[PDB]
Design an enzyme around this catalytic site. Sequence first.
Site, mmCIF file in Angstrom:
data_model
loop_
_atom_site.group_PDB
_atom_site.id
_atom_site.type_symbol
_atom_site.label_atom_id
_atom_site.label_comp_id
_atom_site.label_asym_id
_atom_site.label_seq_id
_atom_site.Cartn_x
_atom_site.Cartn_y
_atom_site.Cartn_z
ATOM 1 N N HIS A 112 0.724 -1.221 0.037
ATOM 2 C CA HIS A 112 -0.001 0.022 0.177
ATOM 3 C C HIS A 112 0.869 1.139 -0.074
ATOM 4 O O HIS A 112 2.151 1.205 0.459
ATOM 5 C CB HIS A 112 -1.022 -0.069 1.340
ATOM 6 C CG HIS A 112 -0.156 -0.010 2.599
ATOM 7 N ND1 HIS A 112 0.547 -0.754 3.163
ATOM 8 C CD2 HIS A 112 0.052 1.217 3.364
ATOM 9 C CE1 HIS A 112 1.119 -0.579 4.093
ATOM 10 N NE2 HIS A 112 0.726 0.886 4.353
ATOM 11 N N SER A 156 0.367 5.855 -1.015
ATOM 12 C CA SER A 156 -0.339 7.064 -1.581
ATOM 13 C C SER A 156 -1.255 6.540 -2.750
ATOM 14 O O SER A 156 -2.164 7.235 -3.167
ATOM 15 C CB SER A 156 0.396 8.223 -1.667
ATOM 16 O OG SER A 156 1.187 8.561 -0.591
ATOM 17 N N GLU A 214 -3.710 0.510 -3.236
ATOM 18 C CA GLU A 214 -3.237 -0.761 -2.429
ATOM 19 C C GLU A 214 -3.159 -1.924 -3.608
ATOM 20 O O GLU A 214 -3.718 -1.787 -4.585
ATOM 21 C CB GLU A 214 -4.483 -0.956 -1.560
ATOM 22 C CG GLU A 214 -4.705 -0.260 -0.453
ATOM 23 C CD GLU A 214 -6.018 -0.501 0.447
ATOM 24 O OE1 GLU A 214 -7.166 -0.289 -0.277
ATOM 25 O OE2 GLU A 214 -5.913 -1.240 1.460
ATOM 26 N N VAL A 215 -2.232 -2.890 -3.278
ATOM 27 C CA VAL A 215 -2.067 -3.944 -4.225
ATOM 28 C C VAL A 215 -2.635 -5.198 -3.309
ATOM 29 O O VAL A 215 -2.055 -5.437 -2.197
ATOM 30 C CB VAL A 215 -0.895 -4.384 -4.814
ATOM 31 C CG1 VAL A 215 -0.707 -5.490 -5.672
ATOM 32 C CG2 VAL A 215 -0.351 -3.007 -5.544
ATOM 33 N N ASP A 243 11.603 4.184 -13.423
ATOM 34 C CA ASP A 243 11.418 3.565 -11.833
ATOM 35 C C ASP A 243 11.996 2.038 -11.612
ATOM 36 O O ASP A 243 11.374 1.467 -10.810
ATOM 37 C CB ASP A 243 10.151 4.007 -11.403
ATOM 38 C CG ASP A 243 10.252 4.152 -9.722
ATOM 39 O OD1 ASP A 243 11.290 4.403 -9.102
ATOM 40 O OD2 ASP A 243 8.919 3.976 -8.946
HETATM 41 C C1 LIG Z 1 -1.393 -5.715 -9.952
HETATM 42 O O1 LIG Z 1 -0.887 -4.332 -10.228
HETATM 43 C C2 LIG Z 1 0.544 -4.115 -9.865
HETATM 44 C C3 LIG Z 1 1.178 -5.028 -8.937
HETATM 45 C C4 LIG Z 1 2.229 -4.628 -8.421
HETATM 46 N N1 LIG Z 1 3.405 -5.544 -7.559
HETATM 47 C C5 LIG Z 1 3.236 -7.014 -7.953
HETATM 48 C C6 LIG Z 1 2.922 -7.404 -9.215
HETATM 49 C C7 LIG Z 1 2.997 -6.744 -10.273
HETATM 50 N N2 LIG Z 1 2.570 -6.085 -11.239
HETATM 51 C C8 LIG Z 1 3.074 -9.154 -9.139
HETATM 52 N N3 LIG Z 1 3.086 -9.956 -8.149
HETATM 53 C C9 LIG Z 1 3.530 -9.170 -6.794
HETATM 54 C C10 LIG Z 1 3.727 -10.147 -5.793
HETATM 55 C C11 LIG Z 1 4.028 -9.424 -4.468
HETATM 56 O O2 LIG Z 1 4.195 -10.634 -3.476
HETATM 57 C C12 LIG Z 1 4.614 -11.910 -3.771
HETATM 58 C C13 LIG Z 1 5.275 -12.661 -2.690
HETATM 59 C C14 LIG Z 1 4.129 -12.001 -1.291
HETATM 60 N N4 LIG Z 1 4.394 -12.816 0.048
HETATM 61 C C15 LIG Z 1 3.741 -12.115 1.170
HETATM 62 C C16 LIG Z 1 4.211 -12.891 2.483
HETATM 63 N N5 LIG Z 1 5.688 -13.109 2.714
HETATM 64 C C17 LIG Z 1 5.734 -13.806 3.649
HETATM 65 C C18 LIG Z 1 6.131 -13.602 1.474
HETATM 66 C C19 LIG Z 1 5.896 -13.122 0.244
HETATM 67 C C20 LIG Z 1 4.205 -8.283 -4.110
HETATM 68 O O3 LIG Z 1 4.277 -7.834 -3.013
HETATM 69 C C21 LIG Z 1 4.357 -6.244 -2.897
HETATM 70 C C22 LIG Z 1 3.689 -7.446 -5.409
HETATM 71 C C23 LIG Z 1 3.514 -7.838 -6.898
HETATM 72 C C24 LIG Z 1 2.946 -3.455 -8.985
HETATM 73 CL CL1 LIG Z 1 4.825 -3.221 -8.506
HETATM 74 C C25 LIG Z 1 2.556 -2.817 -9.879
HETATM 75 C C26 LIG Z 1 1.228 -3.169 -10.342
HETATM 76 CL CL2 LIG Z 1 0.498 -1.945 -11.394
#
Ligand SMILES: COc1cc(Nc2c(C#N)cnc3cc(OCCCN4CCN(C)CC4)c(OC)cc23)c(Cl)cc1Cl
EC number: 2.7.11.1
Length: 296
Positions: free
Chosen positions: A52, A54, A57-58, A167
Amino acid sequence: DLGTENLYFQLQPRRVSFRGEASETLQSPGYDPSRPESFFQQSFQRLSRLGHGSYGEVFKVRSKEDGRLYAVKRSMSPFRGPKDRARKLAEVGSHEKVGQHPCCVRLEQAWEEGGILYLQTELCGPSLQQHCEAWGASLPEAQVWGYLRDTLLALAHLHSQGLVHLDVKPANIFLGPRGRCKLGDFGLLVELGTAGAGEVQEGDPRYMAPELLQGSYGTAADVFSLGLTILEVACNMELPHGGEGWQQLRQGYLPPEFTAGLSSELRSVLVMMLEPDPKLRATAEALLALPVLRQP
Ligand SMILES: COc1cc(Nc2c(C#N)cnc3cc(OCCCN4CCN(C)CC4)c(OC)cc23)c(Cl)cc1Cl
């Protein structure tokens, strides 16, 4: 210029797609548009909040359409107005300009409802940032080389098309199975030579290419950002947001107390990527041609 156009002061979801994909209506098992809950509420199981800020949230979600896991980014509050809307929707256009590539995070679909934008991507493994946090130390070089290679492949794909990510950082490079990774987060991406000359949003200052302070935008900027990203993860080195250290990293300085343990080969590649002069800095394609970065 949308700010002076008659677009000011004007319930069902509408698909967002620039590549063209009528219809714009959404449907899903679990969704009835006559119920008051949003398409997002009705059509997904919300499992956890991945992040999360500003922006909003994702969420990690399970789709009721196919039973598979996805990540969904939801904007924080309804569009401020036409410029805000256009800026947020532009992310979908960018994500689509990139198109499908094995080292880029895939966008599954996107829609707006009630002034909120939703982007649904494949669910990846942990970000490089998360992975390094969990490791609690420098990453082994064998891992680093694979991450460097895959993110360079992603950048070569963007750059061949005159796109700059702007970025690149540990937090938007995501691990997959057996040592691969994918670049995501195309919200700041720009197509060089497309108006306005400004309109550009700024990436994380820790990874920013020095020439951006003078407004000198080009694909070289991403190579520098990836250089510092890899330096950080390979050395477990916190990067300054500013001050003397920020300046030094942009003058060819590699701090000995963090970098003396690098192999000569990885150090040599990082020096090529961190060249202060963007005209002299290696391109992603040139780096990928080096035998050390060949398909392992
Ligand atoms: C949907 O839209 C967008 C999503 C994102 N970000 C991500 C994308 C993409 N894309 C894909 N996959 C992601 C997977 C993530 O976590 C996986 C592991 C989590 N576990 C949590 C618990 N612990 C113990 C183990 C690990 C994750 O976490 C922050 C962010 C992800 C972006 Cl940066 C931009 C846009 Cl637009």
